[model samples]
Target: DRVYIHPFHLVIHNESTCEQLKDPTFIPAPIQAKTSPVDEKALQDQLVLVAAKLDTEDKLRAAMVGMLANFLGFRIYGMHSELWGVVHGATVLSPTAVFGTLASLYLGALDHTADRLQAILGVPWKDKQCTSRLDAHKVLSALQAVQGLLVAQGRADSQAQLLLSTVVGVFTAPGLHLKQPFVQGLALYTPVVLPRSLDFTELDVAAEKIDRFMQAVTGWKTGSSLMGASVDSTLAFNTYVHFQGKMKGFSLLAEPQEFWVDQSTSVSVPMLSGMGTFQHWSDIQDQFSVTQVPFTESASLLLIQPHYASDLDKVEGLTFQQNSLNWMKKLSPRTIHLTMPQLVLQGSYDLQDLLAQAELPAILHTELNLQKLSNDRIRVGEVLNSIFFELEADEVLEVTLNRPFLFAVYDQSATALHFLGRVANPLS
Candidate 1:
């Protein structure tokens, strides 16, 4: 005799076999009906209670923000490794935006999906009794607050000059209704939440429309489309984050400076020069050194270079793959002169591809459940997280990035990695 068990129950019993146990014939049990519809009034009331909870849990919120930042940074860096040579010129990404979007998804996930999301997020319940106690709304709201704090400090008249902005959107298929709680939770955390209807039957047309919409929203001219139409998708998420700042007391060079792309190639590009007290470190074992220069009161830009410019790839492997934070622990403060290209970088990423590259393909697999999002089975199509970054500064001990180098924008208060990228050819 053979015994039958629901795939959902199997997921709860043993998660490791979820992919293997998933069967096309197996249907999940129906979700229990909710008595009332979620409305604006209900969301406001919920927000009131959430705000009170946050007021009393300052330390908890800070810790969660830090953990999310580190985990998201690690995953984003892993994804970038796969696209290193494939992408030309400077590449940048906002790990914070990606983290916020994933956290929002976790708010509407159930069973194995929720468990896997929580694990990917790297923040779990303190005990088994608190299994269902991870409040994604609270986490997202706290992250927003952290971003607000950073921007506030950056905008201060007496402090370093900086500006940062983030936006998130969700597009759904026509006639598909979403859960009120999920929609409201997203609005509370993300800067934008669009619930537009899309016609996925015409793949090329739909992709073009999406690209246009993103270009309008981000105010950036596009090079390639962000999505390919999918017939089975019912929902999709997109995020955009922009950061720009001027290095305090720094000046731009009178004319563009020549930067070596490699031993045999070079290009002229705008350059910024500055000298000031910065956090510095040298790793004799790794044969590299790093310097942290503040862009905002609460955020700093970290520049890493190998002693031999040719060893840039090796340092990158160590910093991004092996252990990122370990290098920070070895840093100490020092005064230095720095010269680097004035940056203007934009990156468009597909969340699905990123998840696959990070070794977490289960997120987009068929066995996943997103019942909390809607009553009908929903499939996420093209998820994109785009970012833009610009920096300007004035010259001082000469550490110039004339060749390939790695950089990261780090938030000090939240201990989060905001942006990470590589500059290989400024002209590209």
Candidate 2:
């Protein structure tokens, strides 16, 4: 009979819920045709002639025009550093897929959990009435439109076509039956969806089995401990985006290049170099530089380098936004040299893990009515998005990104960004 020590992490939320929002009569309207004429008309009317421009204001502008464009892009921007700072190593993640995955989950989110999902998704439609709701298919299909439009723009306008390959994979225990309507609409999220069975009995080799299975299906290798820890006794899901493209007229460096991981420590990396008149700017007050290098006529590589001579890890505190300095608004074209790493980098993170470090118990803890997903004692602890990005070269501004830095891939017309990353150590 020693003093009982109550656990610190076992606290539960006591937030109130509305009845109409959860009443049986309330069904969060079944998603109509994947991409309705109304949805296309909604986006295309605003999307016309907005040639891809890079700015967070453009983020809002896209939001003003198309909800999915704003939804997919900005949601990722909020938490990117949360994940990237965890490793401070090279990373790549796509929100384009994450948005659709949640929207896919929405079909099954039948109670207050539905409200939480809808709120977090930030779907832009206003009617103060709790009775107002939109179709999940409309959101997902519009996402596909934004993503596909970028690739279509690249194929026709740029020398090398931009490619996006998404893998939506599900791992579940035996005997968990999922509803068919929820299963059928999954195609709106990716070109394909794979459902596999896993015996949660082997919790020990969980990571290896999942990682190897992904490579078997998509030929893309996954990183370690992807589940972090699991509710694998029930179910898990992952959506991965693989992107490939080169500069409009790309070239390669003759020798292996050097990247300084530390002031005194160095490693050899295959670097790419190019000299073209490019849009670039330096914000000395902000202590960072920005550059835009053309990839496809519609897609461009946006690189952000912090200005500490020998410290890239200091970028840990960096929360890149344009509300104040608006450096992206002021980037001017100039002739300077730019050298960057050939990015064939891959990374993945469970939103559950990333959210813990971001000050949450863990995201997507379960409750009533995951009814359409499965009828087991299933809990969701994983919302995984993986990215594989390949790019071939940038600039005439004498900018050498030899140190660690941030990088992104931006599409001008679609106004939806595909990659947000940081290279802490190229070789590592």
Candidate 3:
């Protein structure tokens, strides 16, 4: 018998969740309230300033999340999925876009500081041997490698733009942008070691190197040419196929302009897709009497907003801490009064129990069937092809286990493949 773990492919409805995030209700506590403790005229000015700041922060967060989701999702269900499946029988999809963008932004900011800033912080960047130029080139190299692998395997069409766009945005931030320059400088200005001193002007030179490097990867070179063509062909195929039978020459790709999905649009779809897939899998496993430790027990759950990961981890001993005492007070138990909190708590317990029933299993099967039907309705083959292309860069291989029911002999063989090998070459 062979157990093959197929990539979980599902329709990503990224509209609603993104919309919700953009709406007033989803705004974080700090940003949601405006015009506090000010006169009507003064409050108007305060509101305007507050709104502008909130908008800027929201836009940045949304962009980061959207870019990360697209790139990470592609890794899971696109070309990289196929490659990893073929080579390793498994693949890991990580939120590299989000983390990478954040890291780049932080580093870029650090590189842009004056000598005074470093002196006050008691940290040294110039004393560090590496320069920004050296770092930029490394990123450029990675971007080129990813693009090359995707194109060589003819899988670049599915998600190349998303990947490139994300890489660009992540490294464009002032603080984050220096990773490449520092690296590039280290490589280019080698043998003549640059002094370990904080200088703002060094970042300017680093930025130029980064810009050129970006242009090369996304330029009209061979790699980008293939990438562009792939995207075009794919769009054309999708549009024509969507209304092929009823309409003539109705090409989705031939539209006047490309309708690119923005951050507010991309977030919701993936979250829903992920949620659906998780639900479907949960049902199947539950029905088969499969038991695995839950990711986190519902009874002991902590309700955290999506942005918690970024905000936490500044304090010692605490993995993530809120740096601002005001922020902490705002989040504390007393400030946000919860009258009849137990009502909400009890409601959740009831819902969990309901979901744990046999009827839930039946509903799950129905949902899975509907998922298949929906795929068929929307040209499932194309979707699969898109996913495979996006995931083609990674390994994908299968292993089969077949043995007669001889417990003594099977035990040794099973242990080697299932346990020992796992130790030798860890799954993650």
Candidate 4:
């Protein structure tokens, strides 16, 4: 028989080490455990059903700010680095995917570990009272809802522009005893099977097995192997998302546009053309221009360009140490015709690796000893996530975005910053 815990109580239980929990080394005191239980399914249902009762859009936005704020925190500014070589580099990340991964794991963490995670996620507290706090269950469902807002609110005859799928898979060491409740709750956020068997210690052989498993589970050939990525010593968590959307107002032109990564070098990629009046801003103080153009009823694309076309560092400087996004919401409308690169980008990153590069390696401790994760209290090694992001824009403003710039996909309905990236060279 397994331990029983009230989800919220487990979060605030300062020390929720249930006495029923026992190690395999010790023999049970004969018939002292309870069995024949079946409430996990009911508990998971309530988490999602009750989460729907959170009708306050204000709270939804507050949660979104936390996620968007972290999106800024992890920016790969001035791409030249020791970890990554000095070259024309660009990157795209689905912060929604990152948010989902942490929220799902928050379900299985130990009380102390979960506390640390909640702090990182910027979960707000109603009061200093330990019991007065927001739990991950609500946060995840809110994320799920925001992701669906664009489609749900679209008109019946509106073009189907967005196709999104997010799934989670946790592969653990063999013979691990995972809690059914944890797995049941995880499914609320995305599709997930109980942790599969894989030996992380077998690094070389494990790579092939992981590839095979990914293929077996979903007909996905990510086009690359995990030969270089590191796996957790005992626990490896995987988050995957595939997003496909048609640009409502923008159309692709046959001519290739010159994108100047720097004044001295340039590259050519097919450009997307659009024209219209849009929310725009000219920040002379920061030497950057901001533009917002809506494609879907609730979703829009934001472009931040430095005054000096080739110098994206200025815009990045603005992104750092400043919540530049909020000011963007209140802007004047300007008419401009635009032509920029048509992009198709995919990204795969490991949480353990990316967090370390983000300068907070201590964020995930060595002995997480997640009780709900496994009976043996194992350590999590790799938290790998992959993203497939494609956006088409058929509408336009007069401004020409022919240089390196930063962009984001924001859902105004829930104030969620779903996709973010830098384009050093569109051809990359």
Best by lDDT: 1
Give the TM-score of each candidate. 0.80, 0.76, 0.18, 0.76
Question: lDDT, candidate 2, residue 265?
Answer: 85
How well does candidate 3 match the true structure in TM-score terms? 0.18
Candidate 1, residues 175-215: lDDT per residue as tens digits?
Answer: 66677777777876744555566666666666676667656
Clashing pairs in 1: 250-394, 251-393, 251-394, 273-394, 273-395, 274-395, 337-397
For model 2, what is the error of residue 355's alpha carbon versus the real structure, in angstroms, after optimal superposition? 2.8
What's the TM for model 4? Answer: 0.76
Q: Which ten residues in a row have the lowest lDDT in candidate 1?
A: 5-14
The RMSD of every model to the true structure, in order and in angstroms, is 9.3, 10.6, 29.0, 8.5
The residue-level lDDT of candidate 3 at 54 comes to 36
Query: For residues 49-128, could you state the per-residue lDDT of candidate 4 as single tens digits?
Result: 43345566534544564454445345533222432231112376666777677767777776666666665554434445
lDDT of 2 by residue, 53-121 (tens): 324543343333243433434544556555465432246656566566667777666666666566555
Clashing pairs in 2: 52-412, 52-413, 335-396, 336-396, 336-397, 336-398, 337-396, 337-397, 337-398
lDDT ranking from best candidate downward: 1, 4, 2, 3
Off by over 4 Å in 1: 1-56, 75-90, 124-133, 222-224, 227-229, 321-323, 357-360, 393-396
Q: What is the C-alpha lDDT of each candidate?
A: 0.65, 0.58, 0.19, 0.60
